[PDB]
Coordinates of C-alpha atoms in Angstrom, one line a residue:
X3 CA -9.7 6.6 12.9
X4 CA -8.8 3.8 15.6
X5 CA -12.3 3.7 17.0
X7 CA -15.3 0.5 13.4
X8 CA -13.3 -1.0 10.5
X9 CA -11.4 1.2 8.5
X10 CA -9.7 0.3 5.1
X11 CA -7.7 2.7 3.0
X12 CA -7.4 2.1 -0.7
X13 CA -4.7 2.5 -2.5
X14 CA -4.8 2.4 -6.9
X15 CA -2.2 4.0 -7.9
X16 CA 0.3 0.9 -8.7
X17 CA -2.6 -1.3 -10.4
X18 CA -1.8 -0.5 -13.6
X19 CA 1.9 -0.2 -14.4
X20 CA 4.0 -0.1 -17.2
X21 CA 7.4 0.1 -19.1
X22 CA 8.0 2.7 -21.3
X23 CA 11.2 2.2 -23.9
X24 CA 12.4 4.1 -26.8
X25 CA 13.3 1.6 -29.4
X26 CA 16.1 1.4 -32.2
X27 CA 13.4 2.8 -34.6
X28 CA 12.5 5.9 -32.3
X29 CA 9.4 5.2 -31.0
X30 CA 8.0 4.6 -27.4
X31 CA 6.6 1.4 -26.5
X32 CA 4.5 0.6 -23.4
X33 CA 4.3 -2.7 -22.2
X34 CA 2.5 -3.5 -19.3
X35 CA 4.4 -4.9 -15.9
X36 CA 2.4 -6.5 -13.0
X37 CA 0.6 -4.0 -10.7
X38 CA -0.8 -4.5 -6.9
X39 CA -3.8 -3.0 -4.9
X40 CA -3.2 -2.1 -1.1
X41 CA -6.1 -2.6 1.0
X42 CA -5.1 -1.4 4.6
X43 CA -6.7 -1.4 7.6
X44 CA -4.8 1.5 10.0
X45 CA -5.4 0.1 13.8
X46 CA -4.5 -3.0 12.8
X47 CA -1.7 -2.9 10.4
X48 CA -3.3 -5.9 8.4
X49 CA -2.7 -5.3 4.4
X50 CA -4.8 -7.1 1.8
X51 CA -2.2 -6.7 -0.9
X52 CA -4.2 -7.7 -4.0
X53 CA -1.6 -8.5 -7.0
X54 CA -3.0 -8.1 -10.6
X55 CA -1.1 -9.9 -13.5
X56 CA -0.7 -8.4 -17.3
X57 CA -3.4 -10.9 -18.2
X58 CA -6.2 -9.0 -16.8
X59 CA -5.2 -6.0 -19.4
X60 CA -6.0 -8.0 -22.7
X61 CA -6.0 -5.8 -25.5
X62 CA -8.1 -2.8 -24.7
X63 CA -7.7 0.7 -24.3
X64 CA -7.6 3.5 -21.5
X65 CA -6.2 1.1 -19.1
X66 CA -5.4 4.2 -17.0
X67 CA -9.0 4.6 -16.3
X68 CA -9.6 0.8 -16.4
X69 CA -7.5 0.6 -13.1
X70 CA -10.0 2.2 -10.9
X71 CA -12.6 0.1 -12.0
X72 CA -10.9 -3.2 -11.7
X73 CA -10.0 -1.7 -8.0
X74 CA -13.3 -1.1 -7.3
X75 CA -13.7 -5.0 -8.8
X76 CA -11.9 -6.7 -6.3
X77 CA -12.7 -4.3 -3.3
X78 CA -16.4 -5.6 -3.7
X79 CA -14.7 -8.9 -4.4
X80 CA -12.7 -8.9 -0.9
X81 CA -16.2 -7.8 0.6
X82 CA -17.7 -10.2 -0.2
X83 CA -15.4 -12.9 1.0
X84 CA -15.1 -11.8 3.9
X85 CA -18.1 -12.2 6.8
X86 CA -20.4 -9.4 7.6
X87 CA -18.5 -8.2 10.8
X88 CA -15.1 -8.2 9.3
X89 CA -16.6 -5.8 6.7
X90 CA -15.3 -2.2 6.8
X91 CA -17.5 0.5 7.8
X92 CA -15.7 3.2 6.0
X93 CA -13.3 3.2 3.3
X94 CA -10.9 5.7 2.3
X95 CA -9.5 6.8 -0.5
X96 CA -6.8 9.0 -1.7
X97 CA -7.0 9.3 -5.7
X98 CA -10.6 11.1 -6.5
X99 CA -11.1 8.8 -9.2
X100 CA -11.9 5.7 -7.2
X101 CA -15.0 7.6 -5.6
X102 CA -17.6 6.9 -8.5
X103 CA -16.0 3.2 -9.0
X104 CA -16.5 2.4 -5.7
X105 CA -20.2 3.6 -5.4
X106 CA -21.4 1.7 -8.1
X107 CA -19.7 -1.7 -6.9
X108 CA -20.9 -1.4 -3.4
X109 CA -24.9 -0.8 -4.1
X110 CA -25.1 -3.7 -2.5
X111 CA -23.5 -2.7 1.3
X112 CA -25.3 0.3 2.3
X113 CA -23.7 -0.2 5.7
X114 CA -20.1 1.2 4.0
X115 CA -19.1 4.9 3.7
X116 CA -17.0 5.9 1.0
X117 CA -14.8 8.9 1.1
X118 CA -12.5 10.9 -0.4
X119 CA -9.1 12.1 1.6
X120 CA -6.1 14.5 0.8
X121 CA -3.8 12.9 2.9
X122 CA -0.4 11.5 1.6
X123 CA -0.2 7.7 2.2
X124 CA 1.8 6.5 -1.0
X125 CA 2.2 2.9 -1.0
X126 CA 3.8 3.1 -4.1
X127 CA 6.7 3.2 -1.7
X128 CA 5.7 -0.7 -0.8
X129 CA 7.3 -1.5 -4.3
X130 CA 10.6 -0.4 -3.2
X131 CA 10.7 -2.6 -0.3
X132 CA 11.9 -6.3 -1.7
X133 CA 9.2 -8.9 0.0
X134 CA 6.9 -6.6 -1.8
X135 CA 8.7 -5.7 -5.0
X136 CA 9.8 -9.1 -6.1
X137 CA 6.2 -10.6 -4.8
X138 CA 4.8 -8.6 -7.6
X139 CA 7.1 -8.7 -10.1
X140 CA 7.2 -12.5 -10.1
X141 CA 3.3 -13.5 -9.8
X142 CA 2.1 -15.5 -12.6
X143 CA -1.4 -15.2 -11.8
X144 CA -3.5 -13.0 -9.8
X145 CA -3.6 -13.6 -6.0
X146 CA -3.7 -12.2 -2.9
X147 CA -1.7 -12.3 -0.2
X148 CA -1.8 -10.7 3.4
X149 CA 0.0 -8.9 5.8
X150 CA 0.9 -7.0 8.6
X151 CA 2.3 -4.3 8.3
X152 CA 3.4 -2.7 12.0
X153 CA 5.3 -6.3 12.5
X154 CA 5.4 -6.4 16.4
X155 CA 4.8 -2.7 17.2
X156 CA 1.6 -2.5 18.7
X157 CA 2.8 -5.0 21.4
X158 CA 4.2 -1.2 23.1
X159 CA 2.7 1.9 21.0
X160 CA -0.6 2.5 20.5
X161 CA -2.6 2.5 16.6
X162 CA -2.1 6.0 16.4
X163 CA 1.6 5.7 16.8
X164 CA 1.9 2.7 14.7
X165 CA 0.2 4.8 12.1
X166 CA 2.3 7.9 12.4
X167 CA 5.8 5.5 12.4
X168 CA 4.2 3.7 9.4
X169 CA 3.0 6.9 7.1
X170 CA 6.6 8.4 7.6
X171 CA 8.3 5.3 6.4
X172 CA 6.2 4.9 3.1
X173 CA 6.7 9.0 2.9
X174 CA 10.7 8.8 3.5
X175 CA 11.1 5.9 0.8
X176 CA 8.5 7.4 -1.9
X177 CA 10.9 10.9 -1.6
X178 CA 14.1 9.4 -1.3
X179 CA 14.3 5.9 -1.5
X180 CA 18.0 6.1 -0.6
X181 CA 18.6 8.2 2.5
X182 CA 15.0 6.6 4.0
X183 CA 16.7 3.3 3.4
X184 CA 20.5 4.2 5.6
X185 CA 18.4 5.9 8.6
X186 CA 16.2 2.5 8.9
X187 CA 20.2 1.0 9.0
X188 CA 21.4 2.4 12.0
X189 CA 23.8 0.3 12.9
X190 CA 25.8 -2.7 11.1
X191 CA 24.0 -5.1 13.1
X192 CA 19.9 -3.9 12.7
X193 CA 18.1 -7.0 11.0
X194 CA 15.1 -7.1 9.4
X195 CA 13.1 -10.7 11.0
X196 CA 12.1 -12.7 7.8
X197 CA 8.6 -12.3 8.9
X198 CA 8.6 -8.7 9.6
X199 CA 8.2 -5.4 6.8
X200 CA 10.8 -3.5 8.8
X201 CA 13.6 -3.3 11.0
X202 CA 14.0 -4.6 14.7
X203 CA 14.9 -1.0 16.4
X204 CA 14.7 -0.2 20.1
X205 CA 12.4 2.8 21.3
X206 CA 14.9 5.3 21.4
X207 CA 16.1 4.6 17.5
X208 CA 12.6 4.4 16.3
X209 CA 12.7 8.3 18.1
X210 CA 15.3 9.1 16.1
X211 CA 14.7 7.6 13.2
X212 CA 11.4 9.2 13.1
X213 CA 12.5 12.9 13.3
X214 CA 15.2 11.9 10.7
X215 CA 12.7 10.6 8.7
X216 CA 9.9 13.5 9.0
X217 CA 13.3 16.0 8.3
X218 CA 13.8 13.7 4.9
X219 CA 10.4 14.5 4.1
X220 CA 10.3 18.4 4.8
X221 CA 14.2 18.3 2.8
X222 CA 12.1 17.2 -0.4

């Protein structure tokens, strides 16, 4: 990483649902909106790709569905974009995107698709509001972009930007809670409207790193 472009894909919140017992005793599933996350790591830019109920229709194994409608609208974004904004490589971390992904990109032999055990669960995304209610509210598909190490690169490097970045999804994703007080150090940390995160001095981002990493061993 941090050398050609990189995107990581995420599936794992396309296709999402409420579950509810009713009166009568049985469970009911109705699907909510759902969102790919198309990230580029030395960057921070997010593709965040939001897909409406409407897509779903009435047919079955919508669990399995997902990966092919996220291999859809990667080829989609491709294509959109010119040649030398293309990624090189992507990445992903659910095994069930690998064959999806093949088959939609016959077309750029130029990108490498792999597999990757690595724990980057933008799930977590959904807890955070601008991208919660974003979701929840859409409509219609769309997508919208993003960036998510705000103004970090400015003084750390990709890698560190990375590192900072992982550890926050990880924190919320394990305890939404606790990640969210040690990102609040102090009555007065702000979040700018434009930014993901907070505005912390270097020292608090030290601290709130280890506290963070210590959140994630704890769980």
């Amino acid at each position: 990483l941090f050398s050609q472009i990189i995107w990581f894909v995420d599936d794992t919140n396309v296709y999402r649902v409420t579950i509810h017992k009713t009166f009568e005793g049985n469970l009911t599933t109705k699907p909510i909106n759902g969102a790919i996350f198309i990230f580029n790591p030395r960057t921070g830019q997010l593709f965040l790709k939001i897909i409406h109920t409407s897509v779903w229709a009435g047919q079955k194994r919508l669990g399995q569905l997902a990966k092919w409608k996220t291999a859809e609208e990667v080829a989609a974004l491709i294509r959109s974009l010119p040649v030398e904004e293309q990624p090189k490589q992507i990445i992903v971390t659910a095994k069930g995107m690998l064959d999806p992904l093949e088959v939609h990109l016959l077309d750029f032999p130029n990108i490498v698709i792999k597999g990757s055990e690595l724990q980057l669960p933008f799930q977590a995304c959904l807890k955070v509001e601008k991208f919660g209610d974003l979701i929840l509210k859409a409509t219609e598909p769309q997508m919208v972009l993003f960036n998510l190490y705000d103004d970090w690169l400015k003084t750390i490097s990709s890698y560190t930007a990375f590192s900072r970045l992982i550890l926050i999804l990880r924190a919320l994703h394990v305890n939404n809670d606790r990640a969210k007080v040690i990102l609040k150090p102090d009555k007065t940390t702000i979040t700018e409207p434009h930014h993901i995160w907070p505005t912390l001095t270097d020292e608090e981002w030290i601290k709130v790193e280890v506290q963070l990493k210590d959140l994630i061993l704890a769980d």
